[PDB]
Amino acid sequence: XXXXXXXXXXXXXXXXXXXXXXXXXXXXXXXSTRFYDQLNHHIFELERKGGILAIASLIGVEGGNATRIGRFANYLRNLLPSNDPVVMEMASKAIGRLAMAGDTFTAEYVEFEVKRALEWLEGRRHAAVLVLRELAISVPTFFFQQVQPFFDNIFVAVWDPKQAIREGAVAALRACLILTTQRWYRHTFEEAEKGFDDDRIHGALLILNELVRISSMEGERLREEMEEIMGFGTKPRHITPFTXXXXXXXXXXXXXXXXXXXXXXXXXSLIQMTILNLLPRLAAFRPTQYLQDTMNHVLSCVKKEKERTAAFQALGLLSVAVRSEFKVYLPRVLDIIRAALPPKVDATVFTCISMLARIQQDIKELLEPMLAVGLSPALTAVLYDLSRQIPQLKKDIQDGLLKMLSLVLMHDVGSITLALRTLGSFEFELTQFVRHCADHFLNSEHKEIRMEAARTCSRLLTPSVSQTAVQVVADVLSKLLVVGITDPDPDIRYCVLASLDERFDAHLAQAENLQALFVALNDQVFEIRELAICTVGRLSSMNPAFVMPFLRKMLIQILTELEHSGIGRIKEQSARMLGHLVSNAPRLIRPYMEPILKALILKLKDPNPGVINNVLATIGELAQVSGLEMRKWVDELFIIIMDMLQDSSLLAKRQVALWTLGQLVASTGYVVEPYRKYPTLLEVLLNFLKTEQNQGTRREAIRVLGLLGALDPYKHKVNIEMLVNMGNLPLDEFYPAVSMVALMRIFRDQSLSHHHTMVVQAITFIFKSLGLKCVQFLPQVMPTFLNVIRVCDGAIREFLFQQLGMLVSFVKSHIRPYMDEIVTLMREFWVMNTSIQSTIILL
Amino acid sequence: CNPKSVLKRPVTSEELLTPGAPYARKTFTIVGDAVGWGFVVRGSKPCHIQAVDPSGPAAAAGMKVCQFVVSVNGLNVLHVDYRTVNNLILTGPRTIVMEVMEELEC
Amino acid sequence: STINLQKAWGAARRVSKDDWLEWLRRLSLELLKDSSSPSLRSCWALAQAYNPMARDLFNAAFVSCWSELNEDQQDELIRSIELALTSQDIAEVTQTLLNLAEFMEHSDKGPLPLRDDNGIVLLGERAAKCRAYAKALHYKELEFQKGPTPAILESLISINNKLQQPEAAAGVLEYAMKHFGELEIQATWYEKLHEWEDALVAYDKKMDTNKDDPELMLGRMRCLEALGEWGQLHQQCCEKWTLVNDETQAKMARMAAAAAWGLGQWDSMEEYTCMIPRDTHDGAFYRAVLALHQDLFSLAQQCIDKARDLLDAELTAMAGESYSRAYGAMVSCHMLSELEEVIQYKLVPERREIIRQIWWERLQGCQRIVEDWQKILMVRSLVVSPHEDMRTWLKYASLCGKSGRLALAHKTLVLLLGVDPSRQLDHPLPTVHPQVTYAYMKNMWKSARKIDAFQHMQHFVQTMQQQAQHAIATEDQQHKQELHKLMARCFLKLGEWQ
Ligand SMILES: O=P(O)(O)O[C@H]1[C@H](OP(=O)(O)O)[C@@H](OP(=O)(O)O)[C@H](OP(=O)(O)O)[C@@H](OP(=O)(O)O)[C@H]1OP(=O)(O)O
């Protein structure tokens, strides 16, 4: 896009720049090569954030290539030596995305960064640390290639007086020790305890914790879950849609930690933060003297500020680990919580109150301040998971929680968003609210309110005999259908339409709703159109008298757009649409299967990849729906698919090719006989196993070898000189004979076009060294050599005629049989060109 | 000889129900897998765990063979047949909430 | 002209594939440069730019050089050849040097002497890892000629089976019987030869004298499952569980589940399948089977895909070296795709007769080995009792007879008949299912009860011709045509027997 591409480049150079980088990545999803390298170089030299956004995004989507790797490697190698913060971490993310591309140069690029990282071990030191952390996560194998340099250099470099290194290098030690445990430990504990004997505190405590934490995931698994905070009996659809040392040192890991936490209680915020993280995980390994040194730092940090968030997380682990002995410090903790909440940070306080239960009847009184705090996603996630683990009063929980929601929804924008997310996330017990919600969505100009109130109402209509209740549900769903047709914002239209599930099909099958749905089959958005035609097809069993005439009209129109529109996209969309009918309305389509299949075969014999892919996915869906009525056309379909399977030139994906072939063999029941008709079938299907890298595809290539049966080896047999040279001759003759044979092989084909001069010279020297015994080889050499002179071009011609002259001088009288051809050659290739004339006169 | 019995304890009825003494209850939440959970319950009255797949998710989260269960996914199944529990676990969600008696080496 | 050669010999600092490949290229080009015959020396320049030329002249360069060397250089070379094959062997380098050793055997000069005996042991082991089973056999036969040992005979047997030459391996067991007797013949040799009857006799003789051992228990259980004696195989399981370790436990359950499934005891089958490791193909398959027994269709499809995923490794390895080796995997894929067509059979009543016809046509394309058929029929028996499809189990009974396993053939036919004629000798044969009865009589004749068979045939044909006359209406004309086609074959048997 050239001018406009450089215009938006400087626009992204000078939120908005992340939306233009995501749009450039979206433009690279569809998509010259030189202009993209120049545009990347234009953004590089100028700003540095937009340059990293240009490099990393293109490589991931457009795909790593030898050209692109060789060029952009120089750009990445220039940024790392000297750069600003934030831009450095973005450049390190561009390394991780390059290293997970999965190319042949990845082995060189990763080991180039790792070797230079070991040389360093401040924009140099922290850069190498970010490189080692992301490579340890993404690439465990080549990260393990240098482990002895890793530990030795890092235990020196970590204990330098720096903070950014201590944050990352310990996380690199985390990624390394996890790989060591699953598959050094003495060298870790020695260098860590040497460091312990205020910069040399918070690093040693994390190293001792690594031996404790990895040995026992029970401590970490509580923290890992709090940070983040169908059915097996379902019948599948009848038509398949297309698709030791850490335990003997853990005691010393807590003993040398219950002193550091007692000494460095308030020395040099950062150290107190790492102490309050580590202390619970050490106590969860082995809980009283250890508890007293833990409890003094944790309890004192709760009253303080800038730590209250991490303090309760540590306190929640301590409450689970130390069960009975912690009960002494319950009045201290609960008084601080009763003082902390009135001010409304406390989003974590509720998460840890959930982990406290993870109980007594006192909690009943604790509910009246808890709910008075306010609506947060943590609070309602807690009370939901509270009633899961301890369902003593699940009725009283829902009583208070519905009373809270009622007080809220009786009465800014972002809160109403979250209030709807709450109302629609987990189950509840709501008629007036929904008729009032029918007012809010219509009378709200906010896109996010409408989109959430839509998600909420669609979720809250899961309870779906009194006539009045039905008429209410009918009214709301009629209003919803109106929104799904008339709303401008297609996202809101998509959410509403997507939310009209199987659950509502009793209501959607009503006459009025079906007249609406028909209008919806001509929506501007193809995806909504797809979803609407699916719904009407699904209802063709409920009310076929109405639905079947309308799907017939739609079928004719779809097949018209397929056959008569001469456009890739429209035809691709039309096949997809015919797809949704076959799957959702198989009864309707069965009588019309022979017309449809002839139209589709005609499309397969037409001279865009996505069109053929959707046509194949439809034929595959017709197979199952046909129910043995397509046998007559089986032979034609098989030939076409086999022609398309062999070779990679065909645009159509092998995956769907193999999938539709599976569905044909399966439904129609063509077994054993196809093997006889097409004997290369077993050679094609055993070639995919040696070529394909995709799992899904390899699975299909197996599933098709399954359905076709296991052929008897004999039935497959029905369906389908150098040593000899030496066996005869003496060695002095053998050596010319094998040399000649080896030269003759290269002679033929286009291999000679590369090794022309070399091959010809060797043959001449052989004949000269032999003498008149070369006459033997004449019938081999001459016919080829003459045909080489005929099809050779340019400079080589002259050289060949020179060497033919040598040949003729050696062969002498024996050249008589081939002389006539040589003259013809000369006659044809004699020109007024001075060069060839002197050559031919010599010949 | 067709059935197999691996439980040394002949009967545990009226012994589990009494609070305290031989065992300490624990709740083990097991997540489903692509090929199944990997546990079998074959206790007539107490529904003791028959076998556990050593490489399965259940063995990773404790779930030793010599255990007894009384509640599954909330519903209390302390006094039902083993086959009935097998129906409940299959008809239930992919993730199963299970309580293990977990006798303390006694 | 032996300085660069001795560097290329005594380097051995190569820690990858392309490093040894580079050693090869440097070695070949140095041999061409050296080569006394100028017709080869002239090709050195071409061999540099183009690799195929260097490899085609490899054997001729070598012989030319190796003849010139004055013994001392040959030892320097031979020592380096030994090290290259023995240590850091690379498939591509190996099969080059094997083709060199073979070329040297055909030469007048004679085979290169490596580590004594001309490396008859080394080159055999190397060809075996190269999967050059014909070279392996030749070398293992040279070793046998020098001396006969039990180890040699064992390896000879395994080589023959890999080469799809069953008769030769059987001949090796006949040699063992004569010259070594019986003690030297292990039961595993019968197991490899598919002599399941003699292997069971061997494992019984061994388990009587020697105290019971994990190895001899699994060997005898493996024989019982191959024979299909599910009664005895399930008895050995139930007796020995607590007596067994967890390592043998994992090698037990794959056979114990097969036995439980055969007997139809689904509670036992669930216990056993959990003990099978999930990483195995069979572990996935048997979990997918207990899915379809409990109607867990969603989980079944999941387990089948993992089963296919684990069959990836097997299918690829077998397909690499001939279709015949790949047949075992092909049968695994047969059973997987049949389990997919049991889900359809349990969901679509309209599809039932189509599925049966497909099943019948598929089984006839498959090879007539009784093990493979038993596997496939056991799968289909998940939703089709033998009475609902007679012709499948009759053709099966036919194979059992012609393969010299009349005991299994008898059991199969008794199960189809409905009762035991063997017990009630005085009673007449039941006339319901006449095609079954006829198959039973022609089995009885093969069992050398040929006076009794003849008498039964006379009774049967009198019954048939009376059952025809009285039941001939216009309606049953296709039935009448099948009843005449039977009676005709009965009359022919009567004659030949008389
Ligand atoms: O083994 P035989 O006593 O000679 O019997 C054969 C044999 O039948 P079985 O299936 O019982 O072995 C043939 O089957 P194949 O094993 O060769 O496949 C069968 O032929 P078909 O498979 O074509 O039915 C043939 O039957 P027919 O005489 O109708 O050709 C039948 O002969 P008898 O029934 O006369 O013994």
Author numbering:
A (entry chain A): 17 to 30, 37 to 53, 60 to 74, 82 to 156, 162 to 223, 233 to 246, 258 to 289, 304 to 317, ...
B (entry chain I): 304 to 409
C (entry chain A): 1261 to 1758
Study authors write:
(e) Fourier shell correlation (FSC) curves for unmasked, spherical, loose, and tight masks, and corrected FSC curve for the map 5 reconstruction, yielding a gold standard FSC resolution of 3.67 Å. In one step, the DEPTOR PDZ domain binds the mTOR FAT domain. The PDZ domain core (aaDEPTOR326–409) adopts a canonical PDZ fold and binds the TRD2 subdomain of the mTOR FAT domain. The interaction interface is formed by a conserved surface of the PDZ domain and three mTOR helices (aamTOR1525–1578). The DEPTOR linker connecting DEPt and the PDZ domain remains largely unresolved (aaDEPTOR231–303), and only the C-terminal region of the linker (aaDEPTOR 304–325) is ordered when DEPTOR is bound to mTOR complexes. Indeed, we observe weak residual density in the DEPTOR-mTORC1 complex at a binding site for helical peptide segments of substrates and the inhibitor PRAS40 on the FRB domain, which might represent a dynamically interacting segment of DEPTOR or copurified interacting proteins. Thus, a secondary linker-mediated, low-affinity binding mode of DEPTOR (or in trans-phosphorylation without recruiting signal) is required and provides a plausible explanation for the residual signal at the FRB domain.
DEP domain-containing mTOR interacting protein (DEPTOR), conserved in vertebrates, modulates the activity of the serine/threonine kinase mammalian target of rapamycin (mTOR), a master regulator of cell growth. mTOR acts in two functionally distinct multiprotein complexes, mTOR complex 1 (mTORC1) and mTORC2, and DEPTOR is the only protein reported to bind and inhibit both mTOR complexes.
